[PDB]
Amino acid sequence: KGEELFTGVVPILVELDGDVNGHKFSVSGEGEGDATYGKLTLKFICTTGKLPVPWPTLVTTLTYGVQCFSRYPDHMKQHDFFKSAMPEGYVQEATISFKDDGNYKTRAEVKFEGDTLVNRIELKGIDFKEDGNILGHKLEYNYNSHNVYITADKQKNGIKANFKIRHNIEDGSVQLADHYQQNTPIGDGPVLLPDNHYLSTQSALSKDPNEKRDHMVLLEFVTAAGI
Numbered sequence: 001k002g003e004e005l006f007t008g009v010v011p012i013l014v015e016l017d018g019d020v021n022g023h024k025f026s027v028s029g030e031g032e033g034d035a036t037y038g039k040l041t042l043k044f045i046c047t048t049g050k051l052p053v054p055w056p057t058l059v060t061t062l063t064y065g066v067q068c069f070s071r072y073p074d075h076m077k078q079h080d081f082f083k084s085a086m087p088e089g090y091v092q093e094a095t096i097s098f099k100d101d102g103n104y105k106t107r108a109e110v111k112f113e114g115d116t117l118v119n120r121i122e123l124k125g126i127d128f129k130e131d132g133n134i135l136g137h138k139l140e141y142n143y144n145s146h147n148v149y150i151t152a153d154k155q156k157n158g159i160k161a162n163f164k165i166r167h168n169i170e171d172g173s174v175q176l177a178d179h180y181q182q183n184t185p186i187g188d189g190p191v192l193l194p195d196n197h198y199l200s201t202q203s204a205l206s207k208d209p210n211e212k213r214d215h216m217v218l219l220e221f222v223t224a225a226g227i
Helices: 055-064 074-079
Strands: 010-020 023-034 039-046 090-098 103-113 116-126 146-153 158-168 174-185 197-206 215-225
Touching: 010 039, 010 055, 023 055, 039 055, 055 090, 055 103, 055 116, 055 158, 055 174, 055 197, 055 215, 074 215
Parallel strands: 010 116
Antiparallel strands: 010 023, 023 039, 039 215, 090 103, 090 174, 103 116, 146 158, 146 197, 158 174, 197 215
């Protein structure tokens, strides 16, 4: 059973390759997750130089693959798809539509590489406005608390996730970002197909005072609820 691999602290590696309106970039993430408390401590670094998009627009993409660290209460343990697909893992597909702007289409794979949870991501962003909230860097360096609504897809032997992200613009306004996530297992083994529920997410963004590269330090708490 996959949940037995998450009883303690597990090291995490996130590698992202992106392209938004022709602007190519790479992000490397390192940290750890402790599913017993739904705790994620991560540090993401843009290894290609300056990030052409604001850091908050990438939080869901960079934390999507680590939803296996969500704290599922004991009474909800039969509803944990994420941990059940482990060690073999799952393929991730997401479409992030920014209101009155472009979209991000992501393809990722999350699995165990030894005793390390790895998330390899490819991001493709198109039709973004030059002086928009994204390419114009008009978004505040913060992240609002939200829910990730999960539904099962028995035909694909996986799950779906739907939620709205409201990014805070510097003028006090809001930039809506609708998310549609789809997860399909890599392995042939049995996975847990859940009833409708949600993941309550709280995220705190910060900077490392001694780090000179474009980066993002993240403290995140994810908890399953609804059942």
